[PDB]
Amino acid sequence: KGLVPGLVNLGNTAFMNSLLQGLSACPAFIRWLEEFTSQYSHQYLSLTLLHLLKALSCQEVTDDEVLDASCLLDVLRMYRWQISSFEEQDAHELFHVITSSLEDERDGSGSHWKSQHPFHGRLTSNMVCKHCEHQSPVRFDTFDSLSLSIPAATWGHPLTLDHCLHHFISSESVRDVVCDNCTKIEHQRTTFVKQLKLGKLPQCLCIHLQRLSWSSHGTPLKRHEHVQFNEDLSMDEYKYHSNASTYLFRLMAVVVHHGDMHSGHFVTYRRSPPSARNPLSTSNQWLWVSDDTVRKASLQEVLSSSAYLLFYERV
Amino acid sequence: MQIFVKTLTGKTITLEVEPSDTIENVKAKIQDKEGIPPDQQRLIFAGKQLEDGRTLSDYNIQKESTLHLVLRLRGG
Amino acid sequence: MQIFVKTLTGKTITLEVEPSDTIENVKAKIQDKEGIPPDQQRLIFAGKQLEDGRTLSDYNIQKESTLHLVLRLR
Numbered sequence: 001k002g003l004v005p006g007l008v009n010l011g012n013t014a015f016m017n018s019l020l021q022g023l024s025a026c027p028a029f030i031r032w033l034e035e036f037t038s039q040y041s042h043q044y045l046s047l048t049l050l051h052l053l054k055a056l057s058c059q060e061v062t063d064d065e066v067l068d069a070s071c072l073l074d075v076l077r078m079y080r081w082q083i084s085s086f087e088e089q090d091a092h093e094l095f096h097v098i099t100s101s102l103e104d105e106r107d108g109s110g111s112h113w114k115s116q117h118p119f120h121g122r123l124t125s126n127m128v129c130k131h132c133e134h135q136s137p138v139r140f141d142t143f144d145s146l147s148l149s150i151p152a153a154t155w156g157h158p159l160t161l162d163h164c165l166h167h168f169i170s171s172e173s174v175r176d177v178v179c180d181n182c183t184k185i186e187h188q189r190t191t192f193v194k195q196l197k198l199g200k201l202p203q204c205l206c207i208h209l210q211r212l213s214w215s216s217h218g219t220p221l222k223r224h225e226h227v228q229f230n231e232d233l234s235m236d237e238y239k240y241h242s243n244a245s246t247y248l249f250r251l252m253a254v255v256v257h258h259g260d261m262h263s264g265h266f267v268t269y270r271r272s273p274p275s276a277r278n279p280l281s282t283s284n285q286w287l288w289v290s291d292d293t294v295r296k297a298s299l300q301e302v303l304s305s306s307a308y309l310l311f312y313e314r315v
Numbered sequence: 316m317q318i319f320v321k322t323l324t325g326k327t328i329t330l331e332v333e334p335s336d337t338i339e340n341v342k343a344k345i346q347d348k349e350g351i352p353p354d355q356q357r358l359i360f361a362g363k364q365l366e367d368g369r370t371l372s373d374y375n376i377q378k379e380s381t382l383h384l385v386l387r388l389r390g391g
Numbered sequence: 392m393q394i395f396v397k398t399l400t401g402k403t404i405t406l407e408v409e410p411s412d413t414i415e416n417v418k419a420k421i422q423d424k425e426g427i428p429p430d431q432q433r434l435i436f437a438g439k440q441l442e443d444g445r446t447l448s449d450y451n452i453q454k455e456s457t458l459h460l461v462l463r464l465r
């Protein structure tokens with residue numbers, strides 16, 4: 001077969017089990033983990049993560065294997081993420097908790113302090129004052145995921161992932177900005193135009209569709225609309241540099257939320273482990289995992305899902 | 316100093332903060348402009364989710380940094 | 392339609408049900424898949440217990456909703 005092992009959900013941990021299936025569908029993240037882990041050759045999160053990430057990336061060793069990631073949650077919630085005992089949580093929040101530990105872990109290593117994990121990308125913040133036309137020097141900031149506000153729906157047209165990306169990189173006018181050039185001409189306050197674009201792309205792209213918005217009325221609102229993503233994603237449009245290398249990404253896993261704005265459940269659409277004969281080629285058989293339950297899924301089912309976290313890996 | 320916050324729309328706003336300010340201080344100032352209760356806010360900067368009880372200094376948040384605001388979609 | 396029942400025992404049950412279905416009927420579906428007596432079952436939605444006399448539509452339980460099954464061993 002081509003089934004992956006499940007994950008035991010004890011006390012509302014689908015947010016974790018779902019994220020792990022998605023992370024384990026990323027060969028590059030496991031390769032960086034195995035290389036990073038090599039410096040240690042039990043509170044090393046990279047090690048405990050690799051143990052579960054490796055097991056989920058290979059097929060189940062036994063019949064209908066159901067794994068247990070209590071080790072991961074108990075390591076994180078000791079000091080880093082002291083969460084209430086049975087409280088439902090956001091899978092995207094755990095992703096950034098897992099990232100911050102890997103980054104902290106990498107910062108405390110003499111040999112690997114320079115090695116970035118494959119989810120590491122860079123954003124560019126461009127600014128220019130409208131009143132004096134003076135451009136600001138480009139800033140560069142790190143991102144481990146792209147949290148895209150889902151834009152307003154068009155009449156009958158479906159919402160696309162590319163619409164979200166275009167909305168994230170779109171330009172905009174920010175008011176009440178302090179201008180140095182204008183200040184010396186006091187502290188003058190003009191309005192600038194600001195724009196985000198991607199300076200460096202990760203090998204492992206994690207997209208976060210903000211399905212939780214804030215209404216005009218002042219209440220949490222959950223966006224249920226289908227956002228249409230593709231199996232193949234081109235990121236050349238959203239890069240800062242003109243220098244043309246092609247940036248094609250291929251979908252590995254989809255994390256989906258089921259519920260309202262307050263609670264619910266997380267499931268994952270992911271690819272199958274590659275065949276033993278050709279283990280460096282991405283499988284085409286997709287899988288559906290709801291904690292312990294692992295079942296075969298069609299590519300159409302995957303793409304027809306209300307995506308929340310989309311995991312891409314560069315080809 | 317002056318920092319930036321990309322809100323739930325993607326519209327960026329101007330914040331007035333100091334390096335010694337706590338993260339809940341920043342969240343409370345976002346509530347005054349956006350109306351989202353701080354307990355429901357998540358501020359991400361440079362790929363790190365900022366923690367309450369910490370200051371912009373502890374994260375090295377320099378002037379005109381861009382913070383990212385997101386909500387908490389729980390599922391268990 | 393499809394619904395999830397989060398048991399506290401490490402199994403998240405996927406059930407195919409109808410809005411007309413009754414709780415007693417859903418507890419019966421649970422027993423068939425996981426062999427738990429319906430007298431021992433307590434179905435929770437949105438933090439409140441579901442009465443064996445009502446249907447899922449009485450609680451606005453829609454497709455891909457999430458119930459929690461708590462047991463009452465006595």
Ligand SMILES: [Zn+2]
Nearest residue numbers: 129132179182
């Ligand atoms: Zn100016």
